[PDB]
Design an enzyme around this catalytic site. Sequence first.
Site, PDB file in Angstrom:
ATOM      1  N   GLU A   1       0.776  -1.233   0.000  1.00  0.00           N
ATOM      2  CA  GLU A   1       0.000   0.000   0.000  1.00  0.00           C
ATOM      3  C   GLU A   1       0.808   1.284   0.000  1.00  0.00           C
ATOM      4  O   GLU A   1       0.307   2.328  -0.400  1.00  0.00           O
ATOM      5  CB  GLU A   1      -0.859  -0.008   1.270  1.00  0.00           C
TER       6      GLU A   1
ATOM      7  N   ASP B   1      -6.348   6.621  -4.924  1.00  0.00           N
ATOM      8  CA  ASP B   1      -5.836   5.302  -5.052  1.00  0.00           C
ATOM      9  C   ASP B   1      -5.818   4.852  -6.531  1.00  0.00           C
ATOM     10  O   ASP B   1      -6.118   5.622  -7.427  1.00  0.00           O
ATOM     11  CB  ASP B   1      -6.496   4.349  -4.081  1.00  0.00           C
TER      12      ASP B   1
END
Length: 162
Positions: free
Chosen positions: A11, A20
């Site tokens: 991540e 994202d």
Amino acid sequence: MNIFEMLRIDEGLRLKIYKDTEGYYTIGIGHLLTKSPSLNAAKSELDKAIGRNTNGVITKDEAEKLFNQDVDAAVRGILRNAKLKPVYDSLDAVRRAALINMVFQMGETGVAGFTNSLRMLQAKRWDEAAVNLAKSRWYNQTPNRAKRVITTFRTGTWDAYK
Ligand SMILES: [Cl-]
Ligand SMILES: [Cl-]
């Protein structure tokens, strides 16, 4: 290597709101804030999550705190899911981390839909499950991360992360 280290690698860490891979506002170590296209909406969800007027920025400690909560929640969500639990219970420690990774990324409902892969994993047909897992939007959209998680299920080692 452990779940935390594994997800931190997948991540990354960002201290300002960012978008994202799907274009959703996120912060920290993959903490999704909202799916709304509005940055204000994201800032408001961020302040609510942290408990202060953050102005879109948080500290490292704060990111880590969100991360601890998110990991805990994913685990507990697996344990509560009728479809997930039995799978998780059948697996060894390394492979459990791979299942947690997928839930953290895609949500419990999302994972609960890989019915066929779940069945193969439960049956310990590693190569077969790896093949089925790859036939997914998940694999086509984030192939490098997917390949890492898949190798983990196939081998039961952390080699993809070393
Ligand atoms: Cl939260
Ligand atoms: Cl990727």
